[PDB]
Amino acid sequence: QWVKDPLNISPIAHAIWDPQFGQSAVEAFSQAGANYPVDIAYSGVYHWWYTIGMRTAGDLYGGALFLMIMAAVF
Amino acid sequence: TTTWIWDLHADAHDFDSHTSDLEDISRKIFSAHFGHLAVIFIWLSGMYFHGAKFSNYEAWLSNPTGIKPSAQVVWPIFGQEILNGDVGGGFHGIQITSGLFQMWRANGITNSFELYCTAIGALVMAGLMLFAGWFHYHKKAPKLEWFQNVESMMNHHLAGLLGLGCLGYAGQQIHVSLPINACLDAIDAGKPLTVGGKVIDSVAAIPLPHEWILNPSLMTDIYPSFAEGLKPFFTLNWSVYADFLTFNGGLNPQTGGLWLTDTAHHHLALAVLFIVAGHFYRTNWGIGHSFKEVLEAHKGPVTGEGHKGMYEIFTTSWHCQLSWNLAWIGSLSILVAHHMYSMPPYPYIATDYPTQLSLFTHHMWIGGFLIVGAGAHAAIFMVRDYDPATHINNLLDRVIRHRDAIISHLNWVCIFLGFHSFGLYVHNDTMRAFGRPQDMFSDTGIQLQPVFAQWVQNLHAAAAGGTAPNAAAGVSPAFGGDILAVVGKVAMMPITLGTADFLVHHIHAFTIHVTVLILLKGVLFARNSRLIPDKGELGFRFPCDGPGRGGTCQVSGWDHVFLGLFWMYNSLSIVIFHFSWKMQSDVWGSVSPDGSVSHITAGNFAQSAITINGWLRDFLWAQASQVIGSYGSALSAYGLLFLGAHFVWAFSLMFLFSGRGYWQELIESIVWAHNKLKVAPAIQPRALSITQGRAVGVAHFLLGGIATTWAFFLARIIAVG
Amino acid sequence: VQRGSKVRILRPESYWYRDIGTVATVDQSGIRYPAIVRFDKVNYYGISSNNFALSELEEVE
Amino acid sequence: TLTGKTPVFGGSTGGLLTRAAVEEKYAITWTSTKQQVFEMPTGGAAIMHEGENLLYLARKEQCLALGTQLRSKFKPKIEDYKIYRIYPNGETQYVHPA
Amino acid sequence: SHSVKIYDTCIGCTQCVRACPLDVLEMVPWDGCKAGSIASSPRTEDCVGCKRCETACPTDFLSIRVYLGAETTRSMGLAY
Amino acid sequence: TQAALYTHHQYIAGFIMVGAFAHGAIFLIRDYDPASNSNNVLDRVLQHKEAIISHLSWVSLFLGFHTLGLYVHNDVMVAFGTPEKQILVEPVFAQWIQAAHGKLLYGFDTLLSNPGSIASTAWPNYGNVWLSGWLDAINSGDNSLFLTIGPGDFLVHHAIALGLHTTTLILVKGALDARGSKLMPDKKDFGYSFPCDGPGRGGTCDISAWDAFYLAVFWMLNTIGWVTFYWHWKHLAIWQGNVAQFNESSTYLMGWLRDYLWLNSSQLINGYNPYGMNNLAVWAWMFLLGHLVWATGFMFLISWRGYWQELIETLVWAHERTPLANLVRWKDKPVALSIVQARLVGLAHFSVGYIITYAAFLIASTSSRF
Ligand code: CLA
Ligand code: CLA
Ligand code: CLA
Ligand code: CLA
Ligand SMILES: CC1=C(/C=C/C(C)=C/C=C/C(C)=C/C=C/C=C(C)/C=C/C=C(C)/C=C/C2=C(C)CCCC2(C)C)C(C)(C)CCC1
Ligand SMILES: CCCCCCCCCCCCO[C@@H]1O[C@H](CO)[C@@H](O[C@H]2O[C@H](CO)[C@@H](O)[C@H](O)[C@H]2O)[C@H](O)[C@H]1O
Ligand SMILES: CC1=C(C/C=C(\C)CCC[C@H](C)CCC[C@H](C)CCCC(C)C)C(=O)c2ccccc2C1=O
Ligand code: SF4
Ligand code: SF4
Ligand code: SF4
């Protein structure tokens, strides 16, 4: 959803799982067009992976699996 | 070397390190005490001379509720004449917060000539103090048995300095200040100006106070029992005097201050109590109690030999007396702060919010500094004047023998108090950030009501007519009652105690107990410990005993005073922050004609002072807008001093975080560049010593930290109050 | 050498490295450091007198 | 193995700990000509006796600090103090003056 | 334990032996200086590392040097 | 994201730069051979080491006396109500470099802003294909490519030069005195990291080369602090459409306190309040956590060891004398932290509290309005 509109969609870093949240903190962190609590990414990995050609979550998933076997190689 | 330059100023007033014998120090101490009284009299003369020549005091006397007290005028140089702000009365100067004006009006002073002769009169008691310290030292010095005559000193200071001062001020109150203030409270109101020819109409039309003395007919139209004279005093038919000696018991609704007829009966009842107390001690005329005999009588089963040795050290050690007298003057100066905000004793001082905040804060800081000095000179006593033969199985011997029980229990109660006071604040920060306000410690969540303090408040609000029957009102409106308002502003209202007051009171209990822990560990371990068995041989003030035994940095009694000064600073910063927020949120503010109080920060203490975020946002961020926005105005000196004190506090961290072995080696590369060329000195430059670098570091930390709060408090309360 | 000559010191651990000093006394006993040299300025703990071997020393005076 | 009177002392909290029972101990013996008052190295005043004295302390530094007090703080001076290191088996090694 | 080293520049002034609060040091006849005595360190296993000996040494640089080594119960100054 | 990425890589570069000097000093103690390296370039920098350190000391003192003096003078002018008496030096050398790279705002018209200069035409080959795209981007007033700089940018570059030179001065003097000085001539015998050499010879607290690492991390964090404060405030002024607020307030230090620190704290510290919370509540909570960690470091830096060792001795006594708890015995004897360790622990709390305070403030002040 971010590559369709990179100017007004905020990137998502990961989901939040904090059982100590109250219910108004769940709604306060359910942001960036998500219905679960998220962190807005500020590392720039969306802008970097979009420029170098990745477009789908399946693109990043095969990249994630490849760095795991590469780490197992090292 | 340059080390001797600082040791000359550091070893200046350490008189018992100059000379051994006890009688010659006592003459230097007695003479220097005259020299300090003269320094006070020169300072006190400057407050009256600047009160008489550089102020708006009579203009303030005409309009006390709408003119700001000012007594400093700034010369027009460099653009700095902008600090002469318009304080009202056609006067351009610096608004003062010392409360000199409200004290002089309670003294019956009405014009600038009575302030001028008091300035000159203080200036000649400065010279007579400087003569009496020269006469009693350089010519005719006293002797040690006169110095050690503590039964006569306690008689002559109870019935004397305290008795004849409380009685002599009751004479000044009844014959001089009670008429003029009953006169000034009439001219302040529209009616009645009762009565006479002259009736009275001007402030200058009030008679000069020797005419109340010369003419007893002037004294009788206000207080009718002055025609009865001095005669029912000697018959003990005393209820006829209930016109200028009242027990009204509260605040005057006209001025906001204490009833000046109550203060005259206060100083009179203490004069009898002090003079009766001054006939307690046995002297040349046979009868009385003796210090030593009443000390050895109190000797019970739990406590060994009891109070043996207590007479010997309190008559042979100047440091034992100085440590104990600093503990009580500092504790009194703190008690002065609590009793002067809540029972405001001067006319139009209670609605002068820049004065009430400044006087609480000043006497808090003086009290905390002197209590730290009590622990300093108690540790000096243990190093220098403590004697093992004086203390065998007495109270001083037995506290040393269970000092590991005392310190480790004080250690535990400090960790308990820090967890169960500060941890409640960060529990509240976390619950509020979580969106769980029902899980907070608050008045609307999990309540921590101060029920013992609320019960004591109920007894003091139901005292008038009950357990104090002959008193009209309660002792202060702060304990309960209705809102007392001078012209537009609250003087004093009930100060409610909820969950936010429970939390901050246990913060105060925590930060005082840690300061006690640092200073009591410094006293009980000054001579030796399990780490340093000969610590008393190394002195009171030494940096360490080397990097061995793991490292023994800051083991001395001096270094516990050094660490105790930071924790005193931490303790009293929260005390004056508690005062400044609670008064602005729940007490001070403007009164409507309908009778509802609009407080300065609008009641936000109960819901914001329970988190650290609320103290940061609603107290520290919100109220600092007056000091950072003051540039280009009359309060711009507070804006510059806010930044300059931030600088000095940060500058201290260079000394506190570093050590001199770095700085001595950097100076080696500087003296090479000085020897390579030119002027390089003969007095060879050194880094500061380890102790001095700690002393320099704690001095700039305390100066930069306190002056930051000073510029923040004064710029806030002058603009908004 | 002769008592009273000005003396330059050429060892690194000394405070008075390449400093000019005044000799107080010399003894012919056979000890490792026979030359008492006084100095105009104190070291880091106030000595101004250190014994030196003449195998370490330079003089111009 | 060592004789001497224990000084008159009510006890304190600064004395021996578990280390004295399981690792190592120290004793200082000295002979005095007067029944006088001395300061304990662990804090507090005690009464030394005429004749042989015996005091058990935790560290060697506490014993040597007492011996420095026995030298410099009394008229006449007390030089004859002996310091022993006591092991838990009972072996008592004379360590000062070595 | 700590390492206490006495160097050949010792003048035999015995001030380091008087300064030691743990009785680590003693004087040995040496005939390598005018005093004929040199400092020695037999009981270095009792040395705490306080460096009071180095403070008392009047030679420039110090004839006695303390090297803080492996920590024991004795060298850490522990009464427990 | 642009604010976070700059501050991330500048603080990491500051930590890496200080560690370059740290291991340069460890080399001089452990691995350096004055027999092999005999009168080479590395032997020679140690021989005039009092000239390098004293010249770093003069540049640090010259910059600090005149950068702070210019800021305080401007502060007194604005506070007295006369903001035209303040000293505003234009950075004419770096404006000339911008004009020399193709910026037309200052009107110097040298090479690459001169259309007929030798460097712009690239005469014998004319292979200047980049030049049209470069001058299009450098004259667009909407990117961060060679921003307009004024008198507020002059003073803060000289504050940065002060921080670069002082941090180098601590690190160089730590490296060059690592083998010895006059206070401690045999310093290489004691290693890279040791507490002190005792209170003798005047006192030798923080004499090791590790201790000059320790002091320089403070000056590094202050330097990257001044760098990233200036980057953030200049960019926050541009992004808010008010570049004049930086140009008016950055010449005196109250403008930095009020219009940058105080003004942009508003949405951060309202991440939770008595009326509720929003998504900035995690940054508000981290902001206060960073103030707490930073201040906890002051305890390890100001209070030193022998206070704490004597305090732990009463706690060891209390455990052994407490029934039901003296059944539980420690394996390791509780002692206070060492002299070196609490300098490290105090620096670690100071540094962690430094980073996460600013990171919470940088992200929450930028993402609240953007
Ligand atoms: C009745 C009060 C009283 C008296 C008579 C004394 C007297 C003494 N004190 Mg004590 N003491 C006191 C209160 C008092 N003190 C308090 C309140 C504290 C806590 C701070 C202490 C803590 C203390 C310590 C830790 C020590 C003493 C020592 C001494 C002795 C030597 C002082 C000296 O020569 O320094 C000379 C005076 C100075 C060097 C003045 C320095 C003032 C500094 C720089 C702060 C100035 C700030 C100033 C107010 C702000 C203006 C800033 C502006 C100028 C820019 C002397 C017996 C020393 C001692 O050895 O006793 C045997 C010692 O080590 N005192
Ligand atoms: C209980 C003690 C006490 C109290 C509460 C007061 C209260 C007052 N005094 Mg008074 N006075 C007193 C004793 C006291 N006085 C003494 C000991 C002297 C010096 C001899 C004076 C000399 C004096 C002068 C010259 C003036 C005042 C003024 C005032 C009024 C305002 C300033 C003030 O002092 O704040 C309140 C002070 C405190 C809360 C601290 C009390 C400090 C004393 C030393 C404690 C005494 C110990 C205690 C009584 C012993 C316990 C006895 C027994 C029950 C065990 C206020 C009503 C001023 C005024 O304008 O009146 C309207 C004024 O100009 N007083
Ligand atoms: C904000 C900074 C800070 C903090 C947190 C501390 C904390 C402490 N100081 Mg220190 N101190 C400080 C600044 C600080 N100080 C500075 C700047 C100096 C230099 C002068 C000192 C010098 C000093 C001295 C001289 C002494 C202390 C003592 C203490 C302890 C007091 C006892 C207590 O309340 O335990 C409870 C602990 C706290 C209240 C800290 C907050 C803990 C929170 C609420 C708990 C949350 C974490 C929890 C355990 C969950 C685990 C998290 C994770 C590990 C999973 C406490 C640990 C004293 C002491 O040791 O007395 C026993 C003592 O004598 N300090
Ligand atoms: C804001 C706090 C602060 C300030 C102002 C300083 C300032 C300085 N540091 Mg320090 N430093 C600090 C915090 C601070 N440090 C901290 C927290 C640490 C970690 C412990 C260090 C660790 C450190 C190291 C390791 C070194 C420095 C050095 C320096 C000097 C750098 C040279 C320079 O810029 O000269 C300009 C001078 C200034 C900026 C200070 C003067 C301020 C004004 C001009 C004084 C005006 C006089 C004043 C009005 C008179 C007083 C009034 C009255 C009481 C008499 C400078 C004095 C270095 C050094 O000394 O090299 C030569 C050095 O090597 N610092
Ligand atoms: C202490 C020590 C050490 C360390 C060192 C270090 C750490 C240093 C660093 C240093 C550094 C870190 C340096 C840097 C430098 C840089 C530079 C110097 C650069 C250059 C540049 C240039 C020259 C450029 C120019 C240009 C421009 C600007 C534009 C374009 C064109 C050109 C390219 C021309 C060691 C290891 C040896 C060891 C021993 C001791
Ligand atoms: C150094 C001081 C020592 C501080 C020690 C602090 C320990 C922790 C405090 C909790 C102990 C008392 O806590 C007590 O609990 C009850 C039950 O939640 C609170 O009750 C509160 O929450 C309950 C939820 O069920 C509500 O129904 C109730 O209306 C509300 O008042 C009390 O207001 C509080 O007084
Ligand atoms: C900075 C610093 C120094 C260096 C500071 C020093 C050496 C103080 C010296 C500064 C003064 C102001 C130098 C002034 C010299 C003359 C008095 C000036 C003569 C001219 C007058 C007329 C003004 C230490 O010595 C030190 C020691 C221990 C722990 C921390 C530190 C520490 O942090
Ligand atoms: S080592 Fe130093 S103190 Fe000891 S005998 Fe030699 S010179 Fe004297
Ligand atoms: S370091 Fe301390 S214990 Fe060790 S020899 Fe020196 S003085 Fe004795
Ligand atoms: S660091 Fe300083 S105070 Fe601590 S033991 Fe070493 S010399 Fe002493």
Numbering used by the authors:
A (entry chain aB): 76 to 149
B (entry chain aA): 44 to 764
C (entry chain aE): 2 to 62
D (entry chain aD): 4 to 101
E (entry chain aC): 2 to 81
F (entry chain aB): 372 to 741
Excerpt from the publication:
Among the two photosystems, PSI catalyzes the light-driven electron transfer from the plastocyanin (or cytochrome c6) at the lumenal side of the thylakoid membranes to ferredoxin at the stromal side. Here we analyzed the high-resolution structures of the PSI core complexes from H. hongdechloris grown under white (white PSI) and far-red (far-red PSI) light conditions by cryo-electron microscopy (cryo-EM). We purified the trimeric PSI cores from H. hongdechloris grown under white and far-red light conditions and solved their structures by cryo-EM single particle analyses at resolutions of 2.35 and 2.41 Å, respectively.
In the atomic model of the white PSI, each monomer contains five membrane-spanning subunits (PsaA, PsaB, PsaI, PsaL, and PsaM) and three stromal subunits (PsaC, PsaD, and PsaE). The density map for PsaF, PsaJ, and PsaK of the white PSI are rather poor compared with that of the other assigned subunits, and hence, these three subunits were deleted in the structure. Sodium dodecyl sulfate polyacrylamide gel electrophoresis (SDS-PAGE) analysis of the purified PSI solution sample showed that it contained PsaF, PsaJ, and PsaK. Therefore, the poor densities for these three subunits in the cryo-EM map may be owing to the weak association of these subunits with PSI and partial dissociation of them during the grid preparation for cryo-EM. The cofactors of the white PSI monomer contained 90 Chl a, 16 β-carotene (BCR), 3 [4Fe-4S] cluster, 2 phylloquinones, and three lipid molecules. We found no Chl f molecules in the white PSI but seven Chl f molecules in the far-red PSI. As this Chl is located at the interface of monomers in the white PSI trimer, its absence in the far-red PSI trimer may suggest a different energy transfer behavior among monomers between the far-red PSI and white PSI trimers. In agreement with the previous studies, the RC Chls were a pair of Chl a/Chl a′ (epimer of C132–Chl a) in both white and far-red PSI6. In our structure, PsaA_2, PsaB_2, PsaI_3, and PsaL_2 subunits in the white PSI were changed to PsaA_1, PsaB_1, PsaI_2, and PsaL_1 subunits in the far-red PSI, respectively.
